[PDB]
A paper describes a structure:
Anti-CRISPR proteins (Acrs) are naturally occurring inhibitors of CRISPR–Cas systems that have been identified in various bacterial and archaeal species. AcrIC9 is the most recently identified member of the AcrIC family that inhibits the type IC CRISPR–Cas system. Analysis and comparison of its structure with structural homologs indicate that AcrIC9 belongs to DNA-mimic Acrs that directly bind to the cascade complex and hinder the target DNA from binding to the cascade.
AcrIC9 was successfully crystalized as a single crystal diffracting at 2.4 Å under synchrotron radiation. The crystal belongs to space group P3112, with three molecules present in the asymmetric unit (ASU). The final structural models contain residues Met5 to Ser76 for molecule A and Met5 to Glu78 for molecules B and C [Fig. 2(a)]. Since the electrostatic surface features of a protein are sometimes correlated with its function, we analyzed them to obtain information about the working mechanism of AcrIC9. The results of this analysis indicate that the surface of AcrIC9 is highly acidic [Fig. 2(d)]. Therefore, this highly acidic surface feature may indicate that AcrIC9 is one of the DNA-mimic Acrs. Moreover, the long α2–α3 connecting loop and C-terminal loop exhibit a relatively high B-factor value (average of 54.3 Å2) compared with the low B factor (average of 40.2 Å2) of the overall structure. This indicates that although a major part of AcrIC9 is rigid in solution, it contains a relatively flexible α2–α3 connecting loop [Fig. 2(f)]. We performed SPR spectroscopy to confirm the interaction between AcrIC9 and the cascade. As shown in Fig. 4(c) and Table S1 of the supporting information, AcrIC9 binds to the cascade complex with a KD value of 4.32 nM.
Numbering used by the authors: 5 to 75
The structure:
């Protein structure tokens, strides 16, 4: 169910997420809600690379309660 996700957009800063794909999709939708250009899209990161994301401070975690309060 849950995975690390890399969320990218042309000419934009990469974002990083941990959680379910339903939650990464809600997150991407909120990121794009007012993006006229260079919209974001997510890709699921294979477990082989997961160490390079675990504990990272730029990874928004959907498994934390209230992570989506700003939505």
């Amino acid at each position: 169910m849950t995975s690390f996700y890399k969320i990218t957009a042309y000419n934009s800063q990469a974002l990083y997420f941990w959680g379910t794909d339903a939650d990464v999709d809600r997150y991407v939708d909120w990121l794009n809600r007012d993006r006229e250009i260079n919209v974001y899209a997510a890709e699921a990161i294979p477990e082989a690379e997961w160490a390079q994301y675990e504990g990272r401070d730029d990874v928004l975690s959907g498994e934390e309660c209230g992570w989506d309060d700003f939505m």
